[PDB]
Write a protein that binds this ligand. Structure first.
Ligand SMILES: Cc1cnc(Cl)nc1-c1ccc(N(Cc2ccc(CN3CCCC3)cc2)C(=O)c2ccc(O)cc2O)cc1
Ligand SMILES: CC(C)c1ccc(COc2ccc(CC(=O)NCCN)cc2Cl)cc1
Ligand SMILES: [Cl-]
Ligand SMILES: [Cl-]
Length: 343
């Protein structure tokens, strides 16, 4: 076969990060031909850059089953997309079978998260959980997962639009507070199910420049929902379990602030907090892997969604009181550009 030749060829290119504007323009919308000619080049590039990094893991990680399995999905996926390079953009049947091909590739990779987690596990028992192993797992999986978020983004934008308000998974007029309440409502529903007490919500907006206007942005609301959901679930558990022997149950307070460049979402809880020394481990794939806890993408992945369009997600706590979690997002669509791992 040709996979090592392909990987090698296409890893010579750099991925091309897109901005919200580039994304919106792809989606308003007859330029299917153009998304196709873009993607049949860009996907192999992104696949091959990440595939190259996987193949440079030491052989005692690389030869484990979990990694072999995902390596075979990547090989197959890239091969699926090769078939279209010499194919004819004008032939409407080329276009339809390429969409079929993206969906098949999306389904194929759906279970990477639990697959990789078996690899982390196997490595922990098999070679240990020393700080140096931790940094390497961190470094690799943040890049692997960021890369994966970016590919799904490309693919979702194509299949949603080439099957008037929403542009695939981008909402150009996303009402942040609305996404906050929806994620609260959903986490409350689970909290009430498993704990039979749930905090309330207080939302406060601060629109610095337009004191009274509701706060809107261009964003991917499913991502924002993922992050808000994981935060609510954590804050609820902290709040509820820490106030079991007490009657008052503090609310979870969220502030949504709009600056000139940041759009910031703080979620404040009175769950008793975490000492400073234990905070980093909440972002560690390795320390948060062991053979309400069932729901959510997790902290480390929620931070990647934030980073993905040049934002961040940070935690700061006061042991004995509670924790603030903040999502930092870029306010302006012009500063929202894909952040892709640097190969
Ligand atoms: C990471 C995670 C994943 N899945 C779920 Cl279900 N829970 C968490 C999670 C982890 C840490 C936290 N802790 C520490 C904590 C505080 C209070 C209790 C309750 N005690 C515990 C002993 C007695 C009552 C337990 C733990 C936070 O301080 C915290 C972290 C992130 C966060 O976003 C918000 C937070 O409040 C909160 C949630
Ligand atoms: C995500 C899964 C697949 C996973 C599981 C485990 C790992 C671990 O990867 C390690 C572990 C230790 C070291 C230090 C070292 O001794 N390097 C020498 C290299 N021979 C380097 C790397 Cl790349 C990565 C990814
Ligand atoms: Cl990163
Ligand atoms: Cl932090």
């Amino acid at each position: 076969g040709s996979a090592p030749k392909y990987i090698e060829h296409f890893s010579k290119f750099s991925p091309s990060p897109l901005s919200m504007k580039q994304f919106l323009d792809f989606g308003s919308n007859a330029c299917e031909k153009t998304s196709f000619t873009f993607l049949r080049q860009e996907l192999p590039v992104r696949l091959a850059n990440i595939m190259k990094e996987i193949n440079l893991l030491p052989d005692r990680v690389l030869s484990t089953p979990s990694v072999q399995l995902v390596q075979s999905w990547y090989v197959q996926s890239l091969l699926d997309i090769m078939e279209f390079l010499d194919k004819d953009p004008e032939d409407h049947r080329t276009l339809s079978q390429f969409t079929d091909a993206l969906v098949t590739i999306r389904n194929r990779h759906n279970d990477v998260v639990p697959t990789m987690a078996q690899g982390v596990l196997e490595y922990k028992d098999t070679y240990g959980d020393d700080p140096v192993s931790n940094q390497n797992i961190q470094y690799f999986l943040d890049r692997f997962y960021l890369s994966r978020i970016s590919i799904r983004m490309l693919i979702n934008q194509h299949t949603l639009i080439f099957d008037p308000k929403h542009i695939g998974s981008i909402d150009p007029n996303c009402n942040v507070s609305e996404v906050v309440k929806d994620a609260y409502d959903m986490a409350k529903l689970l909290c009430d199910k498993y704990y039979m007490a749930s905090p309330d919500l207080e939302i406060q907006e601060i629109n610095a420049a337009n004191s009274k206007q509701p706060i809107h942005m261009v964003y991917v609301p499913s991502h924002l929902y993922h992050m808000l959901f994981e935060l609510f679930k954590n804050a609820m558990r902290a709040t509820v379990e820490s106030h079991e022997s007490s009657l008052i149950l503090p609310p979870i307070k969220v502030m949504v602030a709009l600056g000139e460049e940041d759009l910031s979402i703080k979620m404040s809880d009175r769950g008793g907090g975490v000492p400073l020394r234990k905070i980093e481990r909440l972002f560690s794939y390795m320390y948060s892997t062991a053979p309400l806890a069932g729901f959510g993408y997790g902290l480390p992945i929620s931070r990647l969604y934030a980073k993905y369009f040049q934002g961040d997600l940070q935690l700061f706590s006061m042991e004995g009181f509670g924790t603030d979690a903040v999502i930092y997002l870029k306010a302006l669509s012009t500063d929202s550009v894909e952040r892709l791992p640097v190969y």
